[PDB]
Amino acid sequence: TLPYLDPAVPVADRVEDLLARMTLPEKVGQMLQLDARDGVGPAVLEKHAGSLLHTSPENVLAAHELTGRTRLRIPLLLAEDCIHGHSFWVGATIFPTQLGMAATWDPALVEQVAHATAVEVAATGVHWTFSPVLCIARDLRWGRVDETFGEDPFLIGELASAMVRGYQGDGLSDPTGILATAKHFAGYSETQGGRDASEADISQRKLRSWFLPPFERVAREGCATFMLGYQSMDGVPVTVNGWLLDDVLRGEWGYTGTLVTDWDNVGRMVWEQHIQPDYVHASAAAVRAGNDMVMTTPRFFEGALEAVDRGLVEEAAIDAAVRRILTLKFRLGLFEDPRRPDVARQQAVIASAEHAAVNLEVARRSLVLLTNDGTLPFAGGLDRAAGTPDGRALAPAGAPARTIAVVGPNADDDHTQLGDWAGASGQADWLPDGHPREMTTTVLDGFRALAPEGWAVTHARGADILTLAPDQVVVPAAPDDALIAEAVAAARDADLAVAVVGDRIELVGEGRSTATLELVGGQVALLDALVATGTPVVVVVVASKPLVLPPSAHAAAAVVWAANPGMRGGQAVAELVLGLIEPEGRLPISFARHAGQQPTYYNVVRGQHGVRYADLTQSPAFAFGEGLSYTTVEYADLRVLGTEHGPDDVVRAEVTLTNTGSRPVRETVQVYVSDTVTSVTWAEKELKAYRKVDLAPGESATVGLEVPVADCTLVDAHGRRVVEPGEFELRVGPSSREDALLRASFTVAG
């Protein structure tokens, strides 16, 4: 012999030979992507599924056996959520979440993480990850903020671009490449009330302005698949959204990759959004819109078959989607090698020492020091034994004996440190105990391993967070006088209190947005009492997203943001506190002071009558881009080199940095552009470029910076992204805070 099995025959002729042999049920089934946890046998044999997701190691082997017993033996696409490492493979390298990764501001490193993930994913026989996420974190109430790269369209685009690159490798023939997905297209991250898949009140212009740019970038860079979002947008779910699917993705951008829906998009139009009377008309609606793969709506099988039989859609429309799906399977070479899992390759590459070292680097660079009164680096900073890199620190001069008290509900919590979409977070049913405990260094673990011989590390759970009850629902723990008293005693007998607080899985993710953003349970009372002991308190926030921190945390000696820092995360936190590394992370997202303060992202649109709420400043608790080091850096003398520009030029600038302190630093210079007068109201400023700079103590450097004129765009009325001629301002400094930015005018001419 048959031509569809002949590798010497062109792919389009192979497609048409196979298609002509297929029954209509076999074609509809090729559009299904089914939940393997419900049983692989019926899915592959009775429904005739093209794809499976959530496939346990046992079911991956069973799926291949069942394909051999089907009439046409069309090989399966096996897809999995491999969200920050290979989430659901016991013993895989689990990296920080996307939000933590974004604090490194380092695309080259994020590419290494995606590549290391793909290497592990490929060995287990998975072909396709639903990753990266390109949603833009605009409402902190939203439960999936941890899955984003933050609040800035440019930074999201840089890092999402790096993940697609690293996942896909050299392309559809790379044995260590896998398909990447551009996820939640588009606008899923800003819906009414910060709720999960409520109405998105987003116009075409607002979508183009703040949400589309990362998607357009990865579409043009060859992202294999796009995933269509849950939410209705101006009344229309993305699944049947003609403007978004035809005018934008397939029209303006000319995207030729494969579409997949999100879990049960087609059925939700019946039972949750109430825009379709039944599943036959939902299926027909989905086919008209030009969908390819339909995820976890099993009744699309009988619904699309009946829709064809009744004349609601043509069989030709089924054919066109099947032609696209088969083309992908043929170009991957699956009919020649369907990329089975290889146990010899699993043992060679999964959780290898190279991958662990990439993981430690991301953890070290993702930590963001938000406040410091001088307590840190603790005892002036520690050294390791001169002979051995790594290993336990030496007791420094001026501090022979110290006691560090590690307290708080997240101080020794394996699962919470890894976050959602990993281990036992709940979406896979084959990892009851999560990943092996010994692969994670918790905060307590890290200090026990690093503290000098003559020091001591004590522990006390100081609070609980929550318990579950029936209306299912979270019950916040009460403050617990005994639990608190035990931590206060540990602190009273110590030189330093490290309080590790935050959230946990029942307060995070799908269907679990939060309204208050506050620490839940007895954590506030624990922080209050620890600060009142007079022992210096370091607040380490291990949480999925930015939280409102109580006053006692702003009165503590220091505050570290860690964002679910992965398996190495607790080694990095202890290294940071003891001064064995310098801090490098910088916020990719803003922290609010109260949920009602929002919006608190840096790129606010101009126009407000006033600058504050009557009962609250509009200034965020911590702003996008900020973060401390253990030294001081002066920014001086910003100059644009030739302030007049035409539309094809590059704005070029120079700025001078001086390290005026005593420790080295890797500084992240941020470059914002402001369009002084605009034809439609626009953001006061936008991030456009950035640069990392290494400074030895005392070193001084003049740094070149550039921004193409073509990047100084807005979305006008009419929805065109255009550079308008006129006056601009270049704002350069260590954060998005206006009192930290040097500024310089430039102009762009018609």
Ligand X SMILES: OC[C@H]1O[C@@H](OC[C@H]2O[C@@H](O)[C@H](O)[C@@H](O)[C@@H]2O)[C@H](O)[C@@H](O)[C@@H]1O
Ligand Y SMILES: OC[C@H]1O[C@H](O)[C@H](O)[C@@H](O)[C@@H]1O
Q: What is the largest CA-CA distance in the chain?
A: 85
Query: Quick one: how far is CA 202 from the chain centroid?
Result: 22
Name the minimum Å distance from CB 139 to its own copies: 10
> What are the start-end ranges of the H helices in 398-557?
414-418, 443-450, 481-492, 523-532, 551-554
Nearest to 240, CA basis, from 291, 310, 298: 291
DSSP 682-697: -BS-EEEEEEEEEE-T
Q: Which residue's CB atom is positioned nearest to Ca ion?
A: 726
Name the minimum Å distance from CB 385 to ligand BGC: 46
Angle at 698 between CA 109 and CA 640, to 5 degrees: 70
Name the minimum Å distance from CB 560 to its own copies: 23
Nearest to 230, CA basis, from 195, 268, 282, 287: 268
**Which is nearer to its own copies, 599 or 708 (by Cβ)?**
599
Range 113-132, binding ligand X (CB under 6 A): 130
Name the minimum Å distance from CB 476 to its own copies: 7
**Which is nearer to its own copies, 244 or 349 (by Cβ)?**
244
Name the minimum Å distance from CB 293 to ligand BGC: 15
Indicate whether 667 belongs to the interface with ligand Y (CB under 6 A): no
The entry of Ca ion, ligand X, ligand BGC, none that residue 726 binds, CB within 5 to 8 Å by partner kind:
Ca ion
Indicate whether 262 belongs to the interface with ligand X (CB under 6 A): yes
> What separation in angstroms does the CA of 623 have from each of 244, 273, 737?
32, 36, 7
Ramachandran bin of 537, using left for φ above 0, alpha for ψ from -120 to 50, beta for the remaining angles: beta
Contact 678, 205 (CB under 8 A): no
Cα separation, 140 vs 152, whole angstroms = 14
Please name the residues in contact with 466: beta carbons below 8 A apart, sequence gap of 6 or more: 474, 475, 476, 477, 504, 506, 507, 520, 521
Indicate whether 185 belongs to the interface with ligand X (CB under 6 A): no
Name the minimum Å distance from CB 81 to ligand Y: 5
Name the minimum Å distance from CB 677 to Ca ion: 5
**Which is nearer to its own copies, 515 or 641 (by Cβ)?**
515
Question: Tokens 């035409």 sit at which residue?
Answer: 646
Give the three-class secondary structure for 744.
strand
**Which is nearer to ligand X, 230 or 591 (by Cβ)?**
230
**Which is nearer to its own copies, 406 or 519 (by Cβ)?**
519
**Binds its own copies by CB under 8 A, chosen from 518, 528, 649, 699:** 518
Q: Which stretch binds its own copies (CB under 8 A): 24-32, 204-212, 412-420, 646-654?
A: 204-212
Indicate whether 55 belongs to the interface with ligand BGC (CB under 6 A): no
Q: Which residue's CB atom is positioned nearest to ligand X?
A: 130
The entry of ligand X, ligand Y, Ca ion, none that residue 675 binds, CB within 5 to 8 Å by partner kind:
Ca ion
Query: What is the number of residues in the chain?
Result: 750
**Binds ligand Y by CB under 6 A, chosen from 263, 447, 622, 690:** 263
**Which is nearer to ligand BGC, 361 or 510 (by Cβ)?**
510
Q: Which stretch binds Ca ion (CB under 5 A): 435-443, 495-503, 669-677, 695-703?
A: 669-677
Q: What are phi and psi of 665, to 5 degrees?
A: -150, 150
**Binds ligand Y by CB under 6 A, chosen from 4, 18, 30, 81:** 81
> What separation in angstroms does the CA of 745 have from each of 144, 174, 635?
38, 48, 17
Q: What is the distance between the terminal CA atoms of the chain, rounded to a whole angstrom?
A: 64
Name the minimum Å distance from CB 386 to ligand Y: 48
Question: Tokens 């947005």 sit at which residue?
Answer: 513
Q: How many residues bind ligand BGC (CB under 6 A)?
A: 3
Question: Tokens 């953890």 sit at which residue?
Answer: 363
Site string for Ca ion, 671-700 (x = CB under 5 A): ----x-x-----------------------
Q: What are phi and psi of 21, to 5 degrees?
A: -85, -10
Range 415-454, binding ligand X (CB under 6 A): 427
Q: What are phi and psi of 102, to 5 degrees?
A: -60, -25
Name the minimum Å distance from CB 416 to its own copies: 14
The entry of Ca ion, ligand Y, its own copies, none that residue 473 binds, CB within 5 to 8 Å by partner kind:
its own copies
Range 245-274, binding ligand BGC (CB under 6 A): 263
Cα separation, 105 vs 365, whole angstroms = 9
Range 387-446, binding ligand BGC (CB under 6 A): 427
Indicate whether 520 belongs to the interface with its own copies (CB under 8 A): yes
For strand 383-384 and strand 258-260, is the pairing parallel, antiparallel, or unpaired?
unpaired
Contact 178, 223 (CB under 8 A): no
Indicate whether 239 belongs to the interface with ligand BGC (CB under 6 A): no
The entry of its own copies, ligand X, Ca ion, none that residue 511 binds, CB within 5 to 8 Å by partner kind:
its own copies
Give the amino acid at 417.
Q
Cα separation, 155 vs 107, whole angstroms = 9
Name the minimum Å distance from CB 351 to ligand Y: 23
Name the minimum Å distance from CB 103 to ligand Y: 21
Question: Tokens 């965020």 sit at which residue?
Answer: 620
Q: Which residues bind ligand Y (CB under 6 A)?
A: 53, 81, 130, 262-263
Contacting positions for ligand X (CB under 6 A)? 81, 130, 183, 262-263, 427, 510
Binding site for Ca ion (CB under 5 A): 675, 677, 724, 726
